[PDB]
C-alpha cells in the first residue's frame, strides 16, 4: 500500500496550498541557512526555497515550475487540481479498478474538455492596450493575493505596460512585450496613493558628484564606458610607482592632463552623461563637475542590457573614443526626491520610446513591501499571454469555470460505453475542490453556499436556448449577501491561455504518480 | 494544521507579558542582558523589544511595527504591542468553536473604518484660545513630572524646559538635539540649561594647565587628526651605527609640526578639538594665547559643535580657510557638579543644546532623564500636528463605548467580533491601574457610569485614585498616536492569526 | 592592446578574406532572385 501512503505524503502538503489560493492566502517566512529571510506569496517561488525530500512531490514541483516559466500565472490551479486527482483516484484503486484504465480515462476526458474551451469564451480582448481595458485582466491577478490593494495597484501596473508597448495592431510576427520590461523597486517610506509610474529604470543610489541633474535640452547623449577612468597604460601589469621624488611631479601632473584631455573631447561631442561600470578615481570626479556631466556608476551587468534597448547606447571596451554612431539618446533626465531621499531617475518624454519601465513602491510596512514586489511579477506574465496563442479569448473565473465543467463532463460520461465511465465521473467530481476551498477558508457554511452553486448552473428552462445567468461563480461575501452574485459585476475573468495550459500540466502531473507502483532509493 | 494557530498565539503572550508592566511612567522595567554583557535599563519599549531578537517568526512582526511606531510617531511603542497582542488572546476561544479565522480577522478591519471617523470627531484644534505661549509649555511640563521625586523641585525644572524648545526651530524639532549627561554628586535643583556641549573630565592626572577659564570671544576650530608628540602608550626604538645619532631618530616629526605651532597663533582659534586623544604638545603653546582645548572628544560631540557655529572639519592646520572658523558669545567653565565642565553659551546658529542634570547617584538621574524625554515628545508632536486629543485612557474608553452600540445595528457574525474588539480595548486602562497600584476592578466599573452620560472627555487620574477629567489634569496626547496605533495593531493582529504553518530551515 | 591618442594590423587579415568574399556575391548568384549565401565561420 505504498501508492496510498504516497498520496498521504502529498496530502500533508495539499492543505498548505489550499490556504494559498484565495483571498485568505499568506506568505510564509523561510529562514535560510545563510541568515537570509525570503518572503513571497507566490507558490512557485516558495517551492524553490523549500527542500523537497520525497521525489513524488518533486513531480508536482516540476509541474508547478512549468506554469511559472511559460504562462507565469495559474501555479495555484495546477498544484491544487493535481492533488485532488489523487484523492478521487484513491477510491478507484481501493474499489479494485486498475490504474491502467484510470490513466486512459483521463486522456479521454482531457480531449473532451479542451474542445469545450472554445465554446465557453465570453468576451474577446481587442488588445487595445488602453489603461481602462487592462484593468479587467490585471484585477484577478492581484486578487486572491493581497486584499485592499487591488484598486490602487491596478492603475500603477496598467500604466507602465502602455509605456513600453509601441503602436501596432493585428501584427503577431514581431514580438514586443518581454518579461524583463517591468522592474519593481522598493524604498522605505511613503504610501500606496503617492506612488507614481516611471517610463524607465529607477536608480535609488547617489550620483556621487556635485552635479545633481542635467539640463532640459532635448536628446541627451548617454555613453556607457566599461573601462575604468585612469591614465592609459600597458594592459599587462602597469602599476604606477615612485622611485624618487623627482618623478612625482611628472607622474602626478601627467594623470591630470591626460584625463582632462579625454573629458574635453567627450564634452565637445554633446555627451552630458557618462556611465562607468567600473570604479571611478578621485581626480576624475573633479573634472566632471565643471563640465556639467552627470556621474553614474552601474557595476551590475544585468542593468546595462535593458539600457541598450532604450536610448541605444553601446558599451565601449576602451576609453576616450566617443563614437557618435553607438551613442544613445534620452529626451529628459531629472533628479527628484521620491520616498524621502533624493535619487536620480530615468524617464522619457516623446521620442526614443523606452521598452523597459519601472514602478516605484512606497509604504510603511516592510512585510507587505516585498509582497507587492512578488505580486507584480505574476502580473507581468499576464500581458505576455495576450499574443496569438489565444490571447484575446477569456473565460469566467472565481470558481465559475470548474463548476460549469461538471455538467458538460457528466453528460459525455453516459455517452461513452464501457469501463471509461468510472474515470469520467470522478474527473468532474475532482473539480469540486475549487469552490469548496474558497467557501471553507472564507468561513462560509458548506450547507449553504455549496448547494447554491449547483443550482446556479443547473436550472429548468422551458426551451432549448440557455437563459437567466450562467456567470454566477463563487462569492467571498465580506459584507452580506443571499446565495451568490454575478461575477460580471466585478469583471473578474480568466484568460484561455492560462486555463488551457493549466489543464494539460495538471493532467500529466497526476498521471505520473498513479503510474508509479514502486520507488527504489538509496542514502546519499 | 489548526494547532499551529494556537501555538502562535501563546508564543506572543510570553513576549506581551513582559511588555505589560512597562506600560506607563510608573510601571516596572525589564532587565535585559545583552551578549556583550552591557546592562541597559529603560522604560521605553522601543529599545527594549529590539534587544529580544526572538527566533519565532510571528514575534518579528512586533519588532517591525515598533520601529515604525518610534520613527513616524515616537510615543506609544509599548501600547501598540499590547493592543496588537490583546486581540489575539480574545480570539483564542472563538477559534475552538469552529469559527474560521478569516471572519474574525475581517471583523477587526470593520471597526477600523469606524475608528478613523471617530478620531476626527474627537480631535479638537486649539492653539491661542484660552492659552498663551508660556502658559502652554508651563502647564504641560508639570504633568509629566507629577508622581515623581522631582515634583517638589519641578518649579525650577519647568522654567528650564520652556527655554529648551524655544532655542530650536518650532517647525522642525528633534528630541535628540538636547543632550543629557549624568553628573554624580550635588543637589538636583542646582542644574542649569546650556546651549553648548560638555565633556566628561577624563583627566585625573595633576601638575599642569594653569589658566583662567573666563574668555571673551573664543574662536572655534575643528581638527580631523591628532597632533601630538608625547604619547603614554607606544614607544620608539633607536638602533643605528653612531652613538651621537641616537637622539635625532625620533625627531622626524619636528619641522612640519613646529610650523603648525605658530599657525594657530596667526589664525587665532581659541578652541581646538579632535576625536583622537591629544598629548601635551598642543596644550603647551595654547597657554599664553588663552586657547582652550579638550582631548578625547567623542564622535557625537564634534558633530554638535559643527552645527553650532556653522564651521567645518579640516584634516590639517595648513589649508584651513577662514570661513571654517566660528565664534560664540561667551565661554565660561564653572564648578557646577563639583567639577569644572566646559560649555558654550550664546550661539545664535546653534542647532542643538545640552541639558545637564545633577544628583546624589547616577541611577536617580537616569530616572529623571527618561522622564524629561516624555515631556519633550508631547511638545514635539504638539507643534507640527495641530490635532490634540485627551489621552491617558480618556480616548481609549470612548472608542470602546461607541463600538458596542454599532455592533447591535450590524447583523451577522460581525456583532460578536466588534463587541469583542471593544471589550479588548479595556486592557489599556486596566494595565495602567495595575502598574500604579490602583485597583482596576473598581475603577473600570465606576468609570463606565459617568462615561455614558454624554461627556467624552473623562479620563483617569494618575495622582490620586478616582474618576476625573484629563482636561483639568492637563494630560494631552497627539492625534497621530491613536491613528497610527489602530492601523498598525490591526495589521499585525491579522498577520499572525492567519499563519497555518511555521517553517524554519536549519543548516 | 592598441591605444591611439594601429587598427590596420588587426584588420589586415580580416579585410583580405572579407573583400574576396563580397566579390563572390556580385559575380555569382547576384542576379538570381530568391537565393542567399551563408558563411559557416567556425
Q: What b/e sequence results for A154-173 when a residue is b if at least 16 CB atoms lie within 10 Å of its CB, and e otherwise? A: bbbbbbbbbbbbeeeeeeee
- CB contacts of A29 in chain B (<8 Å) are 57, 60, 503
Question: CB of B324 within 8 A of CB of B285?
Answer: no
Which residue has 513531480 as its cell numbers? A59
Distance CA A224, CA A327 (A): 8
Q: CATH code at A43?
A: 1.10.560.10
* Same domain membership, residue A334 and residue A208: yes
The answer to whether the Cβ–Cβ distance between B102 and A443 falls below 8 Å is: yes
Enumerate residues 6+ apart whose C-beta is below 8 A from A482.
none
Three cell numbers written together for C16: 583580405
A46: nearest CA in chain B?
B503
Which whole-number Å values give the CA distances from A422 to A109, A366, A407, B220, in the listed order? 11, 51, 16, 94
Question: Cβ–Cβ of A24/B102 closer than 8 Å?
Answer: yes
Calculate the alpha carbon distances from B148 to A215, B26, B77, B145, B153 in Å.
61, 9, 22, 6, 10
Residue B193: which H helix or E strand, with range? strand B193-194
Look at residues A371, A392, A413 and tell me which one is the last residue of a structural domain: A392
Domain co-membership, A168 together with A120:
no
Task: Please name the residues between 251 and 270 in chain B that touch chain A, using a CB distance below 8 Å.
Answer: none
CA distance A15 to chain C (A): 55
Chains that touch B (3 or more CB pairs under 8 A): A
Q: What are the chain A neighbours of C1 within 8 Å (beta carbons)? A: 235
A336 and A270, same domain (yes or no): yes
Please say whether the dihedral angle defined by the alpha carbons of residues A158, A163, A164 and A168, taken in this order, is positive or negative: positive
Whole-number Å distance between alpha carbons of B302 and B273: 8
Backbone φ/ψ region at B191: left (φ over 0), alpha (ψ -120 to 50), beta: beta
Kindly state whether residues A380 and A267 are assigned to the same domain.
no
E-only strand ranges, A177-279: 182-188, 197-198, 220-225, 271-276
Flag whether residue B100 sits within 8 Å of chain A, measured between CB atoms: yes
CA angle A165, A169, A170 (to 5 degrees): 130
Q: What residue has cell string 445595528?
A: B409
Domain co-membership, A452 together with A379: no
Which residues in chain B have Cβ-Cβ distances shorter than 8 Å to A33?
505-507
B503–A440 C-beta distance less than 8 A: no
Task: Tell which residue, A518, A522, A514, has the closest CA to residue A60.
Answer: A514
When CB atoms are compared, the residue of A50, A368, A442 closest to B102 is A442
- Is some CB atom of chain A closer than 8 A to the CB atom of B98? no
Residues of A in contact with B411 (CB under 8 A): 480
Pick from A297, A293, A264: nearest CA to A279:
A297
Shared-domain flag, residues A358 and A217: no
Contact, B306 vs B312, CB < 8 A? yes
Output the DSSP codes for B288-351: TTT-EEESS--HHHHHHHHHHH---EESSSSS--GGG-EE-SBEE-B-TTTS-B---B--TT--
Question: Assign residue A270 a region: left if phi > 0, alpha if psi is -120 to 50, beta otherwise?
Answer: left
Mutate which of A12, A15, A20, A26 to disrupt the B interface (most B C-beta within 10 Å)?
A26
Q: In the numeric block, which cell numbers belong to residue A337?
A: 526626491
> Which residue has 495595575 as its cell numbers?
B434
The experimental method is cryo-EM
A340 and A360 co-located in one domain: no
Do residues A41 and A145 share a domain?
no
CATH code of the domain in which A217 resides? 3.50.7.10
* CB atoms A364 and B68 under 8 Å: yes
Backbone angles phi, psi at B182, to 5 degrees: -80, 120
Chain C interface with A: residues with Cβ < 8 Å: 1, 3, 5
Q: Which residues of A touch B501 (CB under 8 A)?
A: 16, 28
Query: Which residue of chain A has the CA closest to C5?
Result: A320
* Closest residue on chain A to B101 (Cα): A443
Bridge-partner residues for B184, per DSSP? Answer: B359
Q: Which residues 226-245 of A have a C-beta within 8 angstroms of C?
A: 232, 235
User: B495 vs A441: CB contact, 8 Å cut-off?
Assistant: no
Q: Report the residue of A230, A232, A236, A257 to disrupt the C interface, i.e. the one with the largest count of C CBs within 10 Å.
A: A232
Closest CA of chain A from C7, distance in Å: 13
Nearest chain B CA: its distance from A293 CA (Å): 27
In contact, A217 and A270? CB cutoff 8 Å: no
Q: Is A480 on the interface with B (CB under 8 A)?
A: yes
Pairwise CA distance, residues B506 & B194, whole Å: 54
Q: A477: buried, middle or exposed (CB in 10 Å: 19+, 13-18, 0-12)?
A: middle
| Residue A37 structural domain | 1-124+393-524
* HEC-encoded secondary structure of B231-254: CCCCCCCCCCCCCCCCCHHHHCCH
Tell me: do A324 and A243 sit in the same domain: yes
Which residue from A231, A215, A319 is spatially nearest to A273, judged by alpha carbons? A215
Contact A347, A333 (CB under 8 A): yes
Cβ under 8 Å to B: A residues 242-261: none
* Measured distance CA(B51)–CA(B35) in Å, rounded: 10
At B137, which helix (H) or strand (E)?
helix B133-144
Closest CA to B109 of B490, B498, B499: B490
Partners of A30 in beta bridges: A38
- Contact between A52 and A45 (Cβ < 8 Å): no
CB A391 within 8 A of CB A419: no
Q: Give yes or no: residues A206 and A292 share one domain.
A: yes
CB pairs under 8 A between A and C: 4
Number of domains in chain A: 3
Domain at A363, CATH number: 3.30.260.10
Say whether the B–A interface has 3 or more Cβ pairs within 8 Å: yes
Distance CA B501, CA B5 (A): 8
Resolution for this experimental structure (Å): 4.4
The DSSP code sequence of A155-189 is: HHHHHHHHHHS-S--S--SS----SSSEEEEEEEB
Query: Based on the domain organization, do A317 and A288 belong to the same domain?
Result: yes
Among A22, A13, A86, smallest CA distance to A430 is for: A86
d(CA B352, CA B175): 10
Q: Say which residues have a Cβ less than 8 Å from residue A23's Cβ, sequence separation at least 6.
A: A143, A144, A147, A442, A476, B102
A479 touches chain C (CB under 8 A): no
Q: A121 in helix, strand or coil? A: coil
Q: Which CA distances in Å does B194 have to B201, B303, B342, B355? A: 17, 17, 10, 6
DSSP B74: -
Is A318's Cβ below 8 Å from some Cβ in C? yes
Inter-residue contact B140 to B379 (CB < 8 Å): yes
Interchain contact A365–B (C-beta under 8 A):
yes
Q: Specify whether A497 is located in the same domain as A402.
A: yes
A24 reaches B (C-beta below 8 A) = yes
Q: Which of A19, A51, A366 sits opposite B64 (nearest CB)?
A: A366
Q: Which of A367, A438, A444, A482 to mutate to test the interface with B (most CBs of B within 10 A)?
A: A367
Amino acid at each position: 500500500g505504498q501508492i496510498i501512503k504516497s498520496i498521504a505524503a502529498i496530502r500533508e502538503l495539499h492543505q498548505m496550498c489550499l490556504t494559498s489560493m484565495g483571498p485568505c492566502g499568506r506568505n510564509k517566512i523561510i529562514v535560510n541557512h545563510l541568515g537570509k529571510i525570503i518572503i513571497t506569496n507566490d507558490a512557485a517561488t516558495m517551492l524553490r526555497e523549500l527542500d523537497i525530500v520525497h521525489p513524488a512531490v518533486k513531480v508536482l514541483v516540476m509541474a508547478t515550475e512549468q506554469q511559472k516559466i511559460d504562462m507565469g500565472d495559474g501555479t495555484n490551479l495546477v498544484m491544487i487540481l493535481a492533488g485532488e486527482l489523487l484523492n478521487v483516484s484513491e477510491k478507484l484503486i481501493s474499489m479494485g479498478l486498475s490504474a491502467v484504465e484510470i490513466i486512459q480515462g483521463y486522456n479521454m476526458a482531457r480531449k473532451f474538455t479542451l474542445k469545450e474551451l472554445d465554446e465557453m469564451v465570453v468576451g474577446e480582448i481587442t488588445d487595445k492596450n488602453d489603461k481602462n481595458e487592462l484593468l479587467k485582466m490585471i484585477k484577478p491577478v492581484i486578487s486572491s493575493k493581497k486584499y485592499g490593494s487591488e484598486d490602487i495597484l491596478s492603475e500603477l501596473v496598467s500604466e507602465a505596460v502602455s509605456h513600453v508597448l509601441p503602436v501596432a495592431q493585428q501584427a503577431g510576427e514581431i514580438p514586443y512585450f518581454n518579461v524583463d520590461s517591468i522592474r519593481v523597486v522598493k524604498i522605505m517610506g511613503g504610501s500606496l496613493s503617492n506612488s507614481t509610474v516611471i517610463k524607465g529604470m529607477v536608480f535609488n543610489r547617489e550620483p556621487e558628484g556635485h552635479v545633481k541633474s542635467l539640463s532640459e535640452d532635448k536628446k541627451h547623449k548617454v555613453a556607457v564606458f566599461t573601462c575604468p577612468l585612469d591614465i592609459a597604460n600597458t594592459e599587462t601589469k602597469g602599476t604606477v610607482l615612485l622611485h624618487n621624488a623627482q618623478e612625482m611631479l611628472d607622474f602626478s601632473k601627467g594623470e591630470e592632463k591626460q584625463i582632462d584631455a579625454m573629458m574635453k573631447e567627450i564634452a565637445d561631442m554633446g555627451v552630458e552623461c557618462i556611465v562607468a561600470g567600473a570604479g571611478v578615481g578621485e581626480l576624475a570626479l573633479h573634472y566632471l563637475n565643471r563640465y556639467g556631466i552627470l556621474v553614474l556608476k552601474v557595476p551590475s551587468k544585468f542593468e546595462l542590457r535593458r539600457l541598450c534597448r532604450v536610448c541605444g547606447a553601446t558599451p565601449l571596451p576602451r576609453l576616450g573614443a566617443p563614437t557618435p554612431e553607438e551613442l544613445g539618446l534620452v529626451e529628459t533626465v531629472k533628479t527628484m526626491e521620491i520616498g524621502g531621499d533624493r535619487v536620480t531617475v530615468f524617464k522619457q518624454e516623446q521620442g526614443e520610446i523606452s521598452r523597459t519601465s519601472t514602478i516605484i513602491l512606497r509604504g510603511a510596512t516592510q512585510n507587505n513591501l516585498d509582497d507587492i514586489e512578488r505580486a507584480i511579477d505574476d502580473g507581468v506574465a499576464a500581458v505576455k499571454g495576450l499574443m496569438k496563442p489565444s490571447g484575446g479569448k477569456l473565460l469566467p473565473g472565481a470558481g465559475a469555470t470548474e463548476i460549469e465543467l461538471i455538467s458538460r463532463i457528466t453528460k459525455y460520461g453516459e455517452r461513452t460505453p464501457g469501463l471509461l465511465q468510472l474515470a469520467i465521473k470522478q474527473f468532474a467530481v475532482a473539480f469540486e475542490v475549487v469552490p469548496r476551498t474558497l467557501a471553507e477558508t472564507a468561513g462560509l457554511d458548506v450547507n449553504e453556499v455549496l448547494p447554491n452553486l449547483y443550482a446556479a448552473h443547473n436550472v429548468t428552462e422551458p426551451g432549448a436556448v440557455k437563459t437567466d445567468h450562467l456567470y454566477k461563480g463563487v462569492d467571498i461575501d465580506g459584507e452580506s449577501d443571499e446565495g451568490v452574485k454575478d461575477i460580471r459585476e466585478e469583471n473578474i475573468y480568466d484568460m484561455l491561455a492560462t486555463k488551457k495550459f493549466a489543464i494539460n500540466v495538471a493532467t500529466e502531473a497526476a498521471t505520473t504518480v498513479l503510474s508509479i507502483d514502486q520507488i527504489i532509493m538509496a542514502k546519499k | 494544521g489548526k494547532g499551529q494557530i494556537i501555538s502562535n498565539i501563546n508564543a506572543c503572550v510570553a513576549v506581551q507579558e513582559a511588555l505589560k508592566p512597562t506600560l506607563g511612567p510608573l510601571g516596572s522595567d525589564i532587565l535585559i542582558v545583552t551578549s556583550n554583557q552591557k546592562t541597559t535599563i529603560s522604560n521605553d519599549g522601543a529599545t527594549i523589544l529590539k534587544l529580544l531578537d526572538v527566533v519565532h517568526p510571528a514575534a518579528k512582526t512586533l519588532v517591525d511595527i515598533s520601529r515604525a511606531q518610534d520613527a513616524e510617531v515616537g510615543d506609544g511603542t509599548t501600547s501598540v504591542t499590547i493592543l496588537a497582542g490583546e486581540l489575539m488572546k480574545e480570539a483564542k476561544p472563538f477559534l475552538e468553536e469552529g469559527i474560521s479565522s478569516h471572519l474574525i480577522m475581517k471583523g477587526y478591519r470593520k471597526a477600523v473604518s469606524l475608528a478613523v471617523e471617530k478620531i476626527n470627531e474627537l480631535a479638537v484644534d486649539i492653539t491661542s484660545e484660552k492659552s498663551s505661549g508660556r502658559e502652554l509649555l508651563e502647564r504641560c511640563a508639570r504633568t509629566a513630572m507629577s508622581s515623581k521625586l522631582i515634583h517638589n523641585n519641578a518649579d525650577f525644572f519647568v522654567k528650564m524646559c520652556v527655554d529648551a524648545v524655544l532655542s530650536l526651530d518650532r517647525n522642525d524639532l528633534d528630541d535628540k538635539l538636547i543632550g543629557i549627561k549624568k553628573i554624580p554628586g550635588g543637589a538636583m535643583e542646582e542644574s542649569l540649561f546650556i546651549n553648548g556641549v560638555a565633556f566628561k573630565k577624563t583627566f585625573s592626572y595633576a601638575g599642569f594647565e594653569q589658566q583662567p577659564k573666563k574668555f571673551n570671544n573664543p574662536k572655534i576650530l575643528s581638527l580631523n587628526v591628532e597632533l601630538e608628540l608625547k604619547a603614554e602608550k607606544d614607544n620608539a626604538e633607536v638602533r643605528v651605527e653612531h652613538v651621537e645619532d641616537y637622539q635625532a631618530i625620533v625627531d622626524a616629526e619636528w619641522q612640519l609640526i613646529f610650523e603648525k605651532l605658530r599657525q594657530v597663533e596667526e589664525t587665532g582659534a581659541n578652541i581646538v578639538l579632535s576625536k583622537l586623544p591629544i598629548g601635551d604638545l598642543a596644550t603647551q603653546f595654547f597657554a599664553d594665547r588663552n586657547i582652550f582645548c579638550a582631548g578625547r572628544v567623542s564622535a557625537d560631540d564634534m558633530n554638535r559643535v559643527i552645527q553650532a557655529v556653522g564651521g567645518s572639519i579640516q584634516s590639517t592646520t595648513s589649508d584651513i580657510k577662514p570661513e571654517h572658523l566660528g565664534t560664540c558669545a561667551l565661554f565660561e567653565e564653572m564648578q557646577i557638579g563639583s567639577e569644572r565642565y566646559n560649555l558654550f553659551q550664546g550661539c545664535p546658529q546653534a542647532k542643538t543644546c545640552t541639558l545637564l542634570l545633577r544628583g546624589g547617584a547616577e541611577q536617580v538621574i537616569a530616572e529623571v532623564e527618561r522622564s524629561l524625554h516624555d515631556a519633550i515628545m508631547i511638545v514635539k508632536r504638539a507643534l507640527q500636528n495641530k490635532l490634540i486629543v485627551a489621552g491617558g485612557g480618556a480616548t481609549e474608553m470612548e472608542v470602546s463605548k461607541c463600538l458596542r452600540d454599532y455592533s447591535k445595528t450590524i447583523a451577522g457574525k460581525q456583532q460578536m467580533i466588534i463587541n469583542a474588539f471593544a471589550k479588548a480595548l479595556e486592557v489599556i486602562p486596566r494595565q495602567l491601574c495595575e502598574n500604579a497600584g490602583f485597583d482596576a476592578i473598581e475603577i473600570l466599573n465606576k468609570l463606565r457610569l459617568a462615561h455614558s452620560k454624554g461627556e467624552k472627555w473623562y479620563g483617569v487620574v494618575f495622582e490620586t485614585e478616582n474618576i476625573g477629567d484629563n482636561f483639568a489634569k492637563f494630560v494631552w496626547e497627539p492625534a497621530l498616536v491613536k491613528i497610527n496605533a489602530l492601523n498598525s495593531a490591526t495589521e499585525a493582529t491579522n498577520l499572525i492569526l492567519s499563519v497555518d504553518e511555521t517553517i524554519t530551515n536549519k543548516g | 592592446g592598441f591605444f591611439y591618442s594601429l587598427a590596420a594590423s588587426e584588420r589586415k587579415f580580416v579585410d583580405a578574406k572579407l573583400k574576396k568574399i563580397i566579390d563572390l556575391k556580385n559575380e555569382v548568384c547576384g542576379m538570381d532572385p530568391d537565393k542567399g549565401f551563408v558563411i559557416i565561420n567556425q
